[PDB]
């Protein structure tokens, strides 16, 4: 059944490599949890939790990834509750499990809604290597018509 | 004073407020009536009747002398912004890279700027559109005022919706009307007036001078 988890994370990234790493993780539990045919709340959480350090032990224990997946464990359990339709169960989590990660990818949008007036004209930047929400914002910036030029650190290693 | 209008239609030989009427009362032709004056320290005060105060005024409003009413106060729902030395942007308006700006200048909105172009000291009104490799100096341009690429401007008024073509050339003094069009190629001397009917002036509407006459 649902094996490899991982290389539903890797297709994601052949899928799509614009998108970051935990986002691809996120949208592999919730396939994950999608493909379970699960009975009790307990069998849930030991399955993402056996899951999830699969999935974190897979990655170099990479921060950005084992924060997304620790909290997003977290926050399905926030308001979780039981009442007489099991199936509001996996209803309730895969329901919410997709409105975290529909606000997770859009968040890299928002923050440059934010960042993007923080730039002035003929202002100087610098910026330490690649940082992908560095970008975004430089770029909506540069759409919207605004001289500046910035350095790059060149990031060793 | 509400004597004044009826104490101006007698004595009707009055006619210029300062010239006949204070002159009358202060000989005593018109008798027994006193006048004062206001000598105001600060602020601001003047008015608008010569080229040479247009001009003045224009470099001192800019220069916030009548603060609050500035560009940047907007008082029409106008897009204005200040930024230092006296330079002032509206919004949707489009600047090249190249093309810079210096000081004491004004930019109204939807007005294009070529590239490589210098403009400096000068007004120019909205919805207008300059040339690329330009320059213009202590210039007046208004609304819906076009400018071809290369072109020589400088301590010159622009009236509204003005063509001007490429590789033009203009010196200090001059004044243009609406519509008037100058070929490319061209050059225009100093306080040459021009309009678009020999009601007294001279220039027409589309080549540039020694052309079109009548």
């Given at each position: 059944g649902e094996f490899d988890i991982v290389q539903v994370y890797k297709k994601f990234l052949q899928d799509d490599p614009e998108i970051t790493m935990p986002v691809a993780a996120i949208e592999a539990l919730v396939q994950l949890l999608s493909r379970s045919q699960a009975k009790t709340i307990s069998e849930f959480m030991d399955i993402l939790q056996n899951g999830s350090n699969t999935l974190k032990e897979g990655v170099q224990n990479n921060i950005s990834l084992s924060a997304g997946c620790d909290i997003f464990q977290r926050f399905v359990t926030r308001s979780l509750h039981d009442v007489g339709d099991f199936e509001q169960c996996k209803r309730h989590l895969v329901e919410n499990g997709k409105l975290f990660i529909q606000r997770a990818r859009a968040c890299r949008q928002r923050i440059a809604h934010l960042g993007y007036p923080l730039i002035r004209d003929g202002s100087v930047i610098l910026t330490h290597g690649f940082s992908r929400g560095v970008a975004a914002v430089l770029l909506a910036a540069a759409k919207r018509h605004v001289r500046f030029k910035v350095f790059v650190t060149e990031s060793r290693p | 004073s509400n004597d004044v209008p009826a104490l101006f239609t007698e004595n009707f030989d009055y006619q210029d407020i300062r010239k006949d009427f204070v002159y009358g009362v202060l000989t005593s032709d018109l008798l027994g009536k006193k006048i004062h004056c206001?000598?105001?320290?600060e602020n601001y005060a003047a008015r608008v009747r010569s080229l040479q105060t247009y001009d003045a005024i224009s470099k001192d409003v800019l220069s916030r002398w009548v603060y609050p009413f500035v560009?940047?106060?907007?008082?029409?729902?106008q897009t204005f912004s200040y930024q230092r030395h006296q330079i002032y942007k509206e919004e949707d308006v489009v600047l090249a890279r190249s093309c810079i700006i210096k000081a004491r200048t004004l930019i109204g909105a939807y007005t294009k700027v070529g590239d490589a172009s210098v403009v400096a000291n000068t007004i120019i009104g909205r919805n207008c559109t300059i040339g690329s490799n330009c320059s213009i100096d202590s210039a007046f341009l208004w609304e819906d005022v076009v400018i071809g690429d290369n072109c020589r401007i400088g301590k010159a008024i622009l009236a509204n919706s003005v063509k001007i073509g490429n590789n033009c050339s203009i010196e200090d003094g001059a004044i243009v009307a609406a519509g008037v069009v100058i070929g490319d190629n061209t050059i225009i001397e100093k306080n040459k007036r021009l309009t678009t009917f020999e009601s007294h002036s001279q220039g027409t509407l589309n080549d540039p001078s020694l052309v079109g006459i009548g």
């Open positions: - | 206001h000598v105001a320290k560009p940047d106060s907007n008082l029409l729902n």
